[PDB]
mmCIF file of C-alpha atoms in Angstrom:
data_model
loop_
_atom_site.group_PDB
_atom_site.id
_atom_site.type_symbol
_atom_site.label_atom_id
_atom_site.label_comp_id
_atom_site.label_asym_id
_atom_site.label_seq_id
_atom_site.Cartn_x
_atom_site.Cartn_y
_atom_site.Cartn_z
ATOM 1 C CA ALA C 1 23.482 -53.269 41.099
ATOM 2 C CA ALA C 2 24.541 -53.940 37.489
ATOM 3 C CA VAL C 3 20.987 -53.562 36.510
ATOM 4 C CA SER C 4 20.643 -50.181 37.945
ATOM 5 C CA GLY C 5 23.675 -48.874 36.763
ATOM 6 C CA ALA C 6 23.446 -49.552 33.164
ATOM 7 C CA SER C 7 19.995 -48.447 33.067
ATOM 8 C CA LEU C 8 21.106 -45.275 34.661
ATOM 9 C CA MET C 9 23.414 -44.981 31.791
ATOM 10 C CA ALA C 10 20.568 -45.852 29.257
ATOM 11 C CA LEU C 11 17.960 -42.942 30.692
ATOM 12 C CA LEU C 12 21.169 -40.413 30.576
ATOM 13 C CA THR C 13 22.182 -41.617 27.221
ATOM 14 C CA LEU C 14 18.805 -41.330 25.969
ATOM 15 C CA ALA C 15 18.540 -37.704 27.735
ATOM 16 C CA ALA C 16 22.143 -36.889 26.085
ATOM 17 C CA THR C 17 20.474 -37.445 22.690
ATOM 18 C CA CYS C 18 17.092 -35.617 23.273
ATOM 19 C CA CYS C 19 19.217 -32.460 24.689
ATOM 20 C CA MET C 20 21.026 -32.678 21.681
ATOM 21 C CA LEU C 21 18.476 -32.744 19.157
ATOM 22 C CA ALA C 22 16.382 -30.136 21.017
ATOM 23 C CA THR C 23 19.804 -27.997 21.215
ATOM 24 C CA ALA C 24 20.431 -28.907 17.379
ATOM 25 C CA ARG C 25 16.555 -27.616 17.049
ATOM 26 C CA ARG C 26 16.719 -24.574 19.089
ATOM 27 C CA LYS C 27 20.711 -23.301 17.200
ATOM 28 C CA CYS C 28 18.095 -23.583 13.793
ATOM 29 C CA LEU C 29 14.924 -22.913 14.587
ATOM 30 C CA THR C 30 15.796 -19.654 16.857
ATOM 31 C CA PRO C 31 16.934 -17.306 14.319
ATOM 32 C CA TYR C 32 13.273 -17.236 12.165
ATOM 33 C CA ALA C 33 12.187 -16.914 15.445
ATOM 34 C CA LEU C 34 14.139 -13.638 15.753
ATOM 35 C CA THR C 35 14.048 -11.727 12.471
ATOM 36 C CA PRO C 36 11.052 -9.794 11.946
ATOM 37 C CA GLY C 37 9.872 -10.603 9.188
ATOM 38 C CA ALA C 38 11.252 -14.186 7.849
ATOM 39 C CA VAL C 39 9.119 -17.730 8.156
ATOM 40 C CA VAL C 40 10.574 -20.788 8.115
ATOM 41 C CA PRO C 41 11.112 -22.985 4.758
ATOM 42 C CA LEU C 42 8.237 -25.386 4.885
ATOM 43 C CA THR C 43 10.468 -28.349 4.459
ATOM 44 C CA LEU C 44 12.400 -27.197 7.303
ATOM 45 C CA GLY C 45 9.566 -26.840 9.336
ATOM 46 C CA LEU C 46 8.066 -30.393 8.356
ATOM 47 C CA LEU C 47 11.516 -31.576 9.158
ATOM 48 C CA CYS C 48 12.298 -29.670 12.716
ATOM 49 C CA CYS C 49 8.670 -29.980 13.621
ATOM 50 C CA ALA C 50 8.303 -26.133 13.500
ATOM 51 C CA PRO C 51 5.126 -24.950 15.581
ATOM 52 C CA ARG C 52 3.247 -23.161 13.188
ATOM 53 C CA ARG T 1 13.328 14.897 11.689
ATOM 54 C CA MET T 2 10.181 12.908 11.302
ATOM 55 C CA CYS T 3 11.165 9.378 12.108
ATOM 56 C CA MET T 4 10.359 10.386 15.553
ATOM 57 C CA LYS T 5 7.013 10.483 14.763
ATOM 58 C CA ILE T 6 7.132 6.822 14.266
ATOM 59 C CA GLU T 7 10.068 6.027 17.043
ATOM 60 C CA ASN T 8 7.585 7.432 19.820
ATOM 61 C CA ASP T 9 5.095 4.119 19.333
ATOM 62 C CA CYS T 10 7.742 1.632 18.090
ATOM 63 C CA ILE T 11 9.846 2.436 21.207
ATOM 64 C CA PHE T 12 8.632 0.827 25.047
ATOM 65 C CA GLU T 13 10.932 1.693 27.712
ATOM 66 C CA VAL T 14 12.377 -0.949 29.780
ATOM 67 C CA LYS T 15 12.898 -0.256 33.387
ATOM 68 C CA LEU T 16 14.360 -1.701 36.530
ATOM 69 C CA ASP T 17 14.565 -0.255 39.981
ATOM 70 C CA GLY T 18 12.725 2.578 38.881
ATOM 71 C CA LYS T 19 15.082 3.636 36.260
ATOM 72 C CA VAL T 20 15.193 3.245 32.171
ATOM 73 C CA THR T 21 18.028 0.405 31.135
ATOM 74 C CA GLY T 22 17.149 0.733 27.319
ATOM 75 C CA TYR T 23 14.288 0.062 24.794
ATOM 76 C CA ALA T 24 12.230 -2.533 22.998
ATOM 77 C CA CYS T 25 10.629 -1.603 19.405
ATOM 78 C CA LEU T 26 7.632 -3.219 17.730
ATOM 79 C CA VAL T 27 9.472 -4.313 14.225
ATOM 80 C CA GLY T 28 7.158 -5.716 11.901
ATOM 81 C CA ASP T 29 4.840 -8.280 14.057
ATOM 82 C CA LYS T 30 7.838 -8.852 16.334
ATOM 83 C CA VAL T 31 8.975 -6.814 19.386
ATOM 84 C CA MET T 32 13.066 -6.418 19.727
ATOM 85 C CA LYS T 33 14.802 -5.920 22.885
ATOM 86 C CA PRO T 34 18.709 -6.880 23.440
ATOM 87 C CA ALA T 35 18.997 -9.436 25.628
ATOM 88 C CA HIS T 36 21.616 -7.028 27.975
ATOM 89 C CA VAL T 37 18.781 -4.654 28.536
ATOM 90 C CA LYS T 38 17.803 -6.461 31.695
ATOM 91 C CA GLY T 39 14.805 -5.168 33.896
ATOM 92 C CA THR T 40 10.991 -5.069 32.606
ATOM 93 C CA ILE T 41 8.995 -3.021 29.860
ATOM 94 C CA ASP T 42 6.756 -0.707 31.281
ATOM 95 C CA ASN T 43 3.411 -1.845 29.549
ATOM 96 C CA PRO T 44 1.709 -5.127 30.794
ATOM 97 C CA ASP T 45 1.192 -5.938 27.223
ATOM 98 C CA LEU T 46 4.695 -6.352 26.758
ATOM 99 C CA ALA T 47 5.786 -7.889 29.733
ATOM 100 C CA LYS T 48 3.364 -10.905 29.530
ATOM 101 C CA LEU T 49 5.173 -11.839 26.890
ATOM 102 C CA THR T 50 7.114 -15.069 26.602
ATOM 103 C CA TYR T 51 10.480 -14.015 24.609
ATOM 104 C CA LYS T 52 12.227 -16.309 22.693
ATOM 105 C CA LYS T 53 15.597 -14.788 23.535
ATOM 106 C CA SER T 54 19.222 -15.895 21.918
ATOM 107 C CA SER T 55 22.928 -15.560 23.165
ATOM 108 C CA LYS T 56 23.889 -15.172 19.957
ATOM 109 C CA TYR T 57 21.965 -12.528 18.757
ATOM 110 C CA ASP T 58 21.730 -10.505 22.116
ATOM 111 C CA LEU T 59 18.301 -10.841 21.284
ATOM 112 C CA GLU T 60 14.551 -11.075 22.458
ATOM 113 C CA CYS T 61 11.765 -11.357 20.707
ATOM 114 C CA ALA T 62 8.202 -12.195 21.186
ATOM 115 C CA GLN T 63 4.977 -12.054 18.792
ATOM 116 C CA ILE T 64 2.922 -9.037 19.588
ATOM 117 C CA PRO T 65 -0.408 -8.520 21.054
ATOM 118 C CA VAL T 66 -3.125 -8.740 17.966
ATOM 119 C CA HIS T 67 -3.908 -4.562 18.453
ATOM 120 C CA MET T 68 -0.437 -3.554 19.108
ATOM 121 C CA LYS T 69 0.417 -4.324 15.553
ATOM 122 C CA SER T 70 -1.363 -1.544 14.804
ATOM 123 C CA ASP T 71 1.335 0.779 15.525
ATOM 124 C CA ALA T 72 4.355 -0.938 14.862
ATOM 125 C CA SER T 73 7.138 -0.015 12.852
ATOM 126 C CA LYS T 74 7.762 -0.842 8.645
ATOM 127 C CA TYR T 75 11.001 -2.993 8.416
ATOM 128 C CA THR T 76 12.893 -3.218 5.530
ATOM 129 C CA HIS T 77 16.073 -5.813 4.558
ATOM 130 C CA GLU T 78 17.045 -2.591 1.887
ATOM 131 C CA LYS T 79 20.481 -1.522 3.607
ATOM 132 C CA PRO T 80 21.694 1.208 0.861
ATOM 133 C CA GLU T 81 24.959 2.989 0.974
ATOM 134 C CA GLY T 82 23.675 6.235 2.497
ATOM 135 C CA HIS T 83 22.214 8.282 5.018
ATOM 136 C CA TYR T 84 20.025 6.925 7.981
ATOM 137 C CA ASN T 85 18.198 8.368 10.813
ATOM 138 C CA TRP T 86 18.366 7.951 14.985
ATOM 139 C CA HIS T 87 17.343 9.809 17.959
ATOM 140 C CA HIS T 88 20.637 11.471 18.663
ATOM 141 C CA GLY T 89 21.941 12.217 15.834
ATOM 142 C CA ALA T 90 22.202 11.086 11.686
ATOM 143 C CA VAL T 91 23.656 7.718 11.271
ATOM 144 C CA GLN T 92 26.070 7.128 8.000
ATOM 145 C CA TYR T 93 26.358 3.312 6.497
ATOM 146 C CA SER T 94 29.437 2.319 4.989
ATOM 147 C CA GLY T 95 29.828 -0.678 3.503
ATOM 148 C CA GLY T 96 27.784 -2.780 6.607
ATOM 149 C CA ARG T 97 29.195 -0.354 9.037
ATOM 150 C CA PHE T 98 26.613 1.936 10.671
ATOM 151 C CA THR T 99 28.626 4.955 12.390
ATOM 152 C CA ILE T 100 27.702 7.788 14.610
ATOM 153 C CA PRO T 101 29.428 11.062 15.899
ATOM 154 C CA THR T 102 31.290 10.468 19.487
ATOM 155 C CA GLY T 103 29.294 10.875 22.071
ATOM 156 C CA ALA T 104 26.410 10.695 20.530
ATOM 157 C CA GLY T 105 26.022 6.820 21.991
ATOM 158 C CA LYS T 106 25.165 6.930 25.668
ATOM 159 C CA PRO T 107 24.874 4.340 28.515
ATOM 160 C CA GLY T 108 21.932 2.286 28.428
ATOM 161 C CA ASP T 109 20.135 3.977 24.974
ATOM 162 C CA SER T 110 20.358 0.403 23.634
ATOM 163 C CA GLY T 111 17.044 -0.990 21.249
ATOM 164 C CA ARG T 112 16.331 1.942 19.469
ATOM 165 C CA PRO T 113 15.657 1.269 15.881
ATOM 166 C CA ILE T 114 17.643 2.812 13.103
ATOM 167 C CA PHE T 115 15.038 4.525 10.509
ATOM 168 C CA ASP T 116 16.426 4.308 6.543
ATOM 169 C CA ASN T 117 14.716 7.740 4.224
ATOM 170 C CA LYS T 118 11.940 6.230 3.675
ATOM 171 C CA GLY T 119 10.714 5.856 7.610
ATOM 172 C CA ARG T 120 11.293 2.033 7.549
ATOM 173 C CA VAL T 121 13.363 0.156 10.317
ATOM 174 C CA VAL T 122 16.790 -0.958 9.196
ATOM 175 C CA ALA T 123 17.888 -2.688 12.209
ATOM 176 C CA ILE T 124 18.230 -1.829 16.006
ATOM 177 C CA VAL T 125 21.318 -0.435 17.943
ATOM 178 C CA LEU T 126 22.897 -2.670 20.537
ATOM 179 C CA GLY T 127 25.988 -0.680 21.421
ATOM 180 C CA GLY T 128 29.338 1.087 19.767
ATOM 181 C CA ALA T 129 32.831 1.093 19.608
ATOM 182 C CA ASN T 130 35.359 4.159 20.266
ATOM 183 C CA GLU T 131 36.621 4.598 16.366
ATOM 184 C CA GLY T 132 37.702 7.931 17.470
ATOM 185 C CA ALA T 133 35.313 10.700 16.398
ATOM 186 C CA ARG T 134 32.727 8.394 14.348
ATOM 187 C CA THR T 135 31.808 5.816 16.522
ATOM 188 C CA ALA T 136 30.661 2.353 15.131
ATOM 189 C CA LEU T 137 27.763 0.467 16.166
ATOM 190 C CA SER T 138 27.410 -3.096 16.982
ATOM 191 C CA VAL T 139 24.169 -2.707 15.720
ATOM 192 C CA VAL T 140 21.930 -6.101 14.803
ATOM 193 C CA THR T 141 20.799 -5.930 11.172
ATOM 194 C CA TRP T 142 19.196 -8.578 9.264
ATOM 195 C CA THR T 143 18.840 -9.840 5.817
ATOM 196 C CA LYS T 144 15.899 -10.886 3.651
ATOM 197 C CA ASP T 145 15.712 -13.802 5.916
ATOM 198 C CA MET T 146 17.950 -14.082 9.112
ATOM 199 C CA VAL T 147 19.164 -12.304 11.121
ATOM 200 C CA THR T 148 23.030 -10.635 11.129
ATOM 201 C CA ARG T 149 24.177 -9.179 14.425
ATOM 202 C CA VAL T 150 27.035 -7.068 13.356
ATOM 203 C CA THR T 151 29.489 -5.980 15.874
ATOM 204 C CA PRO T 152 32.923 -4.457 15.932
ATOM 205 C CA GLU T 153 36.195 -4.825 17.582
ATOM 206 C CA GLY T 154 36.701 -2.523 21.128
ATOM 207 C CA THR T 155 32.652 -2.325 21.083
ATOM 208 C CA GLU T 156 30.827 -1.194 24.435
ATOM 209 C CA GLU T 157 27.569 -1.906 25.132
ATOM 210 C CA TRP T 158 26.208 1.677 25.455
ATOM 211 C CA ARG B 1 -15.894 6.554 -8.325
ATOM 212 C CA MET B 2 -14.215 5.154 -11.357
ATOM 213 C CA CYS B 3 -14.454 1.366 -9.825
ATOM 214 C CA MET B 4 -18.381 1.804 -9.094
ATOM 215 C CA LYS B 5 -19.043 0.437 -12.515
ATOM 216 C CA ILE B 6 -17.053 -2.649 -11.520
ATOM 217 C CA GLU B 7 -18.490 -2.723 -7.936
ATOM 218 C CA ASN B 8 -22.273 -2.974 -9.348
ATOM 219 C CA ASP B 9 -21.507 -5.112 -11.894
ATOM 220 C CA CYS B 10 -19.337 -7.262 -9.909
ATOM 221 C CA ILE B 11 -21.520 -7.466 -6.157
ATOM 222 C CA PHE B 12 -24.445 -9.859 -5.625
ATOM 223 C CA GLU B 13 -25.748 -9.753 -2.231
ATOM 224 C CA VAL B 14 -26.160 -12.726 0.062
ATOM 225 C CA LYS B 15 -29.142 -12.142 2.733
ATOM 226 C CA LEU B 16 -31.193 -14.196 5.046
ATOM 227 C CA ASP B 17 -33.524 -13.907 8.266
ATOM 228 C CA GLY B 18 -34.462 -10.281 7.168
ATOM 229 C CA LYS B 19 -30.716 -9.251 6.539
ATOM 230 C CA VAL B 20 -27.911 -9.214 4.159
ATOM 231 C CA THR B 21 -25.672 -12.011 5.623
ATOM 232 C CA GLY B 22 -22.594 -10.954 3.089
ATOM 233 C CA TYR B 23 -22.217 -10.573 -1.070
ATOM 234 C CA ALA B 24 -21.323 -12.422 -3.818
ATOM 235 C CA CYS B 25 -19.239 -11.498 -6.933
ATOM 236 C CA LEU B 26 -18.579 -12.530 -10.456
ATOM 237 C CA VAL B 27 -14.903 -13.006 -10.890
ATOM 238 C CA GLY B 28 -13.696 -13.961 -14.597
ATOM 239 C CA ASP B 29 -16.332 -17.123 -14.638
ATOM 240 C CA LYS B 30 -16.224 -17.513 -11.385
ATOM 241 C CA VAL B 31 -19.134 -16.694 -8.737
ATOM 242 C CA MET B 32 -17.490 -16.368 -5.676
ATOM 243 C CA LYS B 33 -18.553 -16.529 -2.379
ATOM 244 C CA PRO B 34 -17.163 -17.391 1.132
ATOM 245 C CA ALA B 35 -18.090 -20.937 2.331
ATOM 246 C CA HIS B 36 -18.667 -19.197 5.915
ATOM 247 C CA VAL B 37 -21.439 -16.794 4.794
ATOM 248 C CA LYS B 38 -24.708 -18.390 5.125
ATOM 249 C CA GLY B 39 -28.049 -17.478 3.085
ATOM 250 C CA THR B 40 -28.866 -17.725 -0.692
ATOM 251 C CA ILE B 41 -28.215 -15.808 -3.901
ATOM 252 C CA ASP B 42 -30.293 -12.977 -5.339
ATOM 253 C CA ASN B 43 -30.130 -14.109 -8.437
ATOM 254 C CA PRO B 44 -32.102 -17.420 -9.262
ATOM 255 C CA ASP B 45 -29.460 -17.492 -12.132
ATOM 256 C CA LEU B 46 -26.397 -17.807 -9.501
ATOM 257 C CA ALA B 47 -28.725 -19.797 -6.444
ATOM 258 C CA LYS B 48 -29.748 -22.886 -9.121
ATOM 259 C CA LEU B 49 -25.575 -23.153 -9.607
ATOM 260 C CA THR B 50 -23.694 -26.177 -8.100
ATOM 261 C CA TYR B 51 -20.855 -25.007 -6.381
ATOM 262 C CA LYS B 52 -17.099 -26.793 -5.194
ATOM 263 C CA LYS B 53 -16.277 -26.168 -1.952
ATOM 264 C CA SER B 54 -13.270 -25.888 0.248
ATOM 265 C CA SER B 55 -13.229 -24.954 4.421
ATOM 266 C CA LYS B 56 -9.418 -24.277 4.262
ATOM 267 C CA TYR B 57 -9.803 -21.290 1.492
ATOM 268 C CA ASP B 58 -13.143 -21.115 2.709
ATOM 269 C CA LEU B 59 -14.553 -20.284 -0.444
ATOM 270 C CA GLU B 60 -17.486 -21.763 -3.068
ATOM 271 C CA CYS B 61 -16.810 -21.089 -6.536
ATOM 272 C CA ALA B 62 -19.452 -21.901 -9.661
ATOM 273 C CA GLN B 63 -19.357 -22.034 -13.499
ATOM 274 C CA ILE B 64 -21.154 -18.801 -14.348
ATOM 275 C CA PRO B 65 -23.927 -18.940 -16.936
ATOM 276 C CA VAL B 66 -22.667 -17.976 -20.645
ATOM 277 C CA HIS B 67 -24.900 -14.510 -20.421
ATOM 278 C CA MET B 68 -23.300 -13.375 -16.980
ATOM 279 C CA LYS B 69 -19.791 -13.759 -18.390
ATOM 280 C CA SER B 70 -20.675 -10.718 -20.261
ATOM 281 C CA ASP B 71 -21.158 -8.725 -16.893
ATOM 282 C CA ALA B 72 -18.089 -10.623 -15.033
ATOM 283 C CA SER B 73 -15.613 -8.523 -13.912
ATOM 284 C CA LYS B 74 -11.636 -8.487 -15.009
ATOM 285 C CA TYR B 75 -9.007 -9.675 -12.377
ATOM 286 C CA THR B 76 -5.434 -9.567 -11.840
ATOM 287 C CA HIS B 77 -3.156 -11.776 -9.897
ATOM 288 C CA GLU B 78 -0.825 -8.607 -9.494
ATOM 289 C CA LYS B 79 -0.352 -7.198 -5.879
ATOM 290 C CA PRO B 80 2.014 -3.668 -6.343
ATOM 291 C CA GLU B 81 2.934 -2.533 -3.016
ATOM 292 C CA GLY B 82 0.316 0.762 -2.216
ATOM 293 C CA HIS B 83 -3.433 1.404 -1.522
ATOM 294 C CA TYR B 84 -6.246 -0.479 -3.344
ATOM 295 C CA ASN B 85 -9.833 0.806 -3.770
ATOM 296 C CA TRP B 86 -12.875 -0.846 -1.441
ATOM 297 C CA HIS B 87 -16.481 -0.469 -1.402
ATOM 298 C CA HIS B 88 -15.953 1.581 2.351
ATOM 299 C CA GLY B 89 -12.262 3.296 1.782
ATOM 300 C CA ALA B 90 -8.691 2.458 0.616
ATOM 301 C CA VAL B 91 -7.001 -1.153 1.646
ATOM 302 C CA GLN B 92 -3.450 -0.275 2.344
ATOM 303 C CA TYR B 93 -1.329 -3.302 1.594
ATOM 304 C CA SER B 94 1.231 -3.070 3.834
ATOM 305 C CA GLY B 95 3.907 -5.450 3.521
ATOM 306 C CA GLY B 96 1.816 -8.086 2.088
ATOM 307 C CA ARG B 97 -1.050 -7.524 4.238
ATOM 308 C CA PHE B 98 -4.125 -6.259 3.288
ATOM 309 C CA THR B 99 -5.454 -3.614 6.034
ATOM 310 C CA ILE B 100 -8.099 -1.333 6.883
ATOM 311 C CA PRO B 101 -9.448 1.672 9.128
ATOM 312 C CA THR B 102 -11.009 0.038 11.918
ATOM 313 C CA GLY B 103 -14.598 0.911 11.767
ATOM 314 C CA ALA B 104 -15.273 0.757 8.008
ATOM 315 C CA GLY B 105 -15.672 -2.753 7.067
ATOM 316 C CA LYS B 106 -18.998 -4.086 9.174
ATOM 317 C CA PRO B 107 -20.241 -7.166 10.674
ATOM 318 C CA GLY B 108 -20.809 -9.275 7.599
ATOM 319 C CA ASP B 109 -19.775 -7.526 5.089
ATOM 320 C CA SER B 110 -17.437 -10.142 3.748
ATOM 321 C CA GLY B 111 -17.367 -11.425 -0.068
ATOM 322 C CA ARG B 112 -16.436 -8.259 -1.424
ATOM 323 C CA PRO B 113 -13.972 -7.589 -3.954
ATOM 324 C CA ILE B 114 -10.575 -5.440 -4.040
ATOM 325 C CA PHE B 115 -9.850 -3.393 -6.721
ATOM 326 C CA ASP B 116 -6.214 -2.522 -8.236
ATOM 327 C CA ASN B 117 -5.851 1.191 -9.770
ATOM 328 C CA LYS B 118 -7.066 -0.672 -12.789
ATOM 329 C CA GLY B 119 -10.514 -1.491 -11.401
ATOM 330 C CA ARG B 120 -9.716 -5.140 -11.888
ATOM 331 C CA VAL B 121 -10.517 -7.488 -8.849
ATOM 332 C CA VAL B 122 -7.225 -9.059 -6.887
ATOM 333 C CA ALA B 123 -8.852 -10.171 -3.611
ATOM 334 C CA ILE B 124 -11.702 -11.097 -1.877
ATOM 335 C CA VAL B 125 -11.881 -10.031 1.782
ATOM 336 C CA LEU B 126 -13.564 -12.253 4.328
ATOM 337 C CA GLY B 127 -13.254 -11.320 7.917
ATOM 338 C CA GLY B 128 -10.822 -9.618 9.308
ATOM 339 C CA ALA B 129 -8.407 -8.935 12.767
ATOM 340 C CA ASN B 130 -9.121 -6.461 15.640
ATOM 341 C CA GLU B 131 -5.975 -4.831 14.772
ATOM 342 C CA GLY B 132 -6.221 -1.623 16.564
ATOM 343 C CA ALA B 133 -7.460 1.441 14.788
ATOM 344 C CA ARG B 134 -5.489 -0.655 11.793
ATOM 345 C CA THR B 135 -7.756 -3.427 10.939
ATOM 346 C CA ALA B 136 -6.460 -6.028 9.024
ATOM 347 C CA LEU B 137 -7.881 -8.156 6.190
ATOM 348 C CA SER B 138 -8.642 -11.615 5.844
ATOM 349 C CA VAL B 139 -7.986 -12.289 2.296
ATOM 350 C CA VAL B 140 -8.290 -14.831 -0.733
ATOM 351 C CA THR B 141 -6.184 -14.063 -3.599
ATOM 352 C CA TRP B 142 -4.222 -15.418 -6.408
ATOM 353 C CA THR B 143 -1.672 -16.488 -8.046
ATOM 354 C CA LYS B 144 -1.004 -17.367 -11.912
ATOM 355 C CA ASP B 145 -2.198 -21.033 -10.788
ATOM 356 C CA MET B 146 -3.402 -21.236 -7.357
ATOM 357 C CA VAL B 147 -6.308 -19.436 -4.892
ATOM 358 C CA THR B 148 -4.387 -18.896 -1.503
ATOM 359 C CA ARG B 149 -5.241 -17.191 1.592
ATOM 360 C CA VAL B 150 -3.887 -14.884 3.869
ATOM 361 C CA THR B 151 -5.691 -14.534 7.759
ATOM 362 C CA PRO B 152 -4.149 -12.889 9.863
ATOM 363 C CA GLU B 153 -4.501 -14.071 13.645
ATOM 364 C CA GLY B 154 -7.035 -12.751 15.764
ATOM 365 C CA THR B 155 -9.416 -12.330 13.283
ATOM 366 C CA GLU B 156 -13.472 -12.059 14.004
ATOM 367 C CA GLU B 157 -15.208 -13.407 11.148
ATOM 368 C CA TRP B 158 -17.149 -10.540 9.621
#
């Protein structure tokens, strides 16, 4: 019981980190995907692993 | 007067339950559609796309097909103080506030471009507020680098 | 007509299998050829040279013989917005993209120079995108210091 509970807390906290970093990426890069003429500054593209 | 020549092929209509709900416009290499405009594009070439929508800018964009870039409208970041062109009437720009004669705005109708005096899309209208005789628009304007959604108090999404 | 001097002084053929595969040009002190153009140069004075390569810029260059520097074309790095002269027509430079009426550029046909309003070469054209009525050129062009390559997606490598 204790190991299953703690390992579920481990997986949930890992998933929360993943969702928070994915949300930060989405919040940062989406304006450059919406704006018609724009392209990301290449340093930020390397940092955020931009798809280009 | 002349900008309707460009609007007639920048615009595609968005249709739901067999009726129009609003528009999408080809701006640069991206199609701009408001997110409140529900339904699907009447053109399969745009309906097949996946749109990187955002709730902050009430906007959905996708990279338009290889061919359709032929007819997409030229944009500009230039927003000089002055006179601007639109389907139902002439827009006036004032310190950031695009404004229109009241009643020229209509339900749906969102997603039309506004054109500058050179025929370039300056921004995409989303709605407007009951600013007396001269409604002020909640159009989503863009800077050199970033979309900067504008919205006056008392907007309705007409 | 005005560029027909610079065209004939700059262009050299690249040919194979009984047909012209593409072209080369004398730009500054460089002989320019696209790296994808397969065959041999029409001129022994160029065909005997040894060339730098790049798979990224898709470009080959060599230092031209000292006599050929008399014929080699004058270049520029400037790109004002507008339109530019080319062997098949006028290339438009809309929004930083070179674009052409579809059907002007043919299969092969690459390695041609593009000229400014003063006859200076400003770009070299590779293939081009099947961009509806307004095919967009894949292009090599240079700044003060660096070569660059512009490649519209959906390019067919003519």
